[PDB]
Amino acid sequence: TPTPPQADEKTEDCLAIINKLRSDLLGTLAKAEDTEVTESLKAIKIEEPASPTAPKIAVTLAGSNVDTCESGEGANAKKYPGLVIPFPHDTEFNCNALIQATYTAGLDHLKQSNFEPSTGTYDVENAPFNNVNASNVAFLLSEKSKKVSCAATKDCKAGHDVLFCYFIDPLRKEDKPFTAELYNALWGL
């Protein structure tokens, strides 16, 4: 019977880079506590793993065997809405580097997309938000985001560890992730 990977809370390691990227069109985010994440998930009918939190979801996404973490590389937000970044088991965790890289790649993917802010909705199964980086940028830059809880698996012996950040309130299918004003400002940068 396999031993699962373990996850550490990473909110304090990640909140500086998240709030740097959001910054007067977006509010800063505060830390979400576990209770808040569990209740936010319960409101969108997500109750497994029991009393779900960012650490428990990072583990769920990486896999149930620390010897393989065989699902980490393919992890995404198709079920658990939030930022998802797999990283190799043999690398040092750097939240600044990981989130900056998803931001640059995801904003490039959106710019390359026929996505328009007036018509474009969030759908993790269709372009452009079926790209995990583009999905990650939608959560990072969401006007619905007020709080965040981040966690990462720390001890995968193979495969990819996973960073997961849960935003309250989550983007959901058919939300318009950006106003025209914010989307125009992202081109300005």
Residue numbers in the entry: 54 to 76, 81 to 246
Can I see the authors' text?
Eimeria tenella causes caecal coccidiosis in chickens and has a SAG family with over 80 members making up 1% of the proteome. In addition, a further 20 regions of the E. tenella genome were identified as encoding sag pseudogenes. These EtSAGs comprise a cysteine-rich ectodomain of ~300 residues, including an N-terminal signal sequence and a site at the C-terminus for a glycosylphosphatidylinositol (GPI) anchor for membrane attachment. We have solved the structure of a representative E. tenella SAG, EtSAG19, revealing that, despite a low level of sequence similarity, the entire Eimeria SAG family is unified by its three-layer αβα fold which is related to that of the CAP superfamily. While it has been established that SAGs are expressed on the surface of Eimeria parasites, it is currently unknown whether these proteins are involved in aspects of cell adhesion, invasion or in some other process.
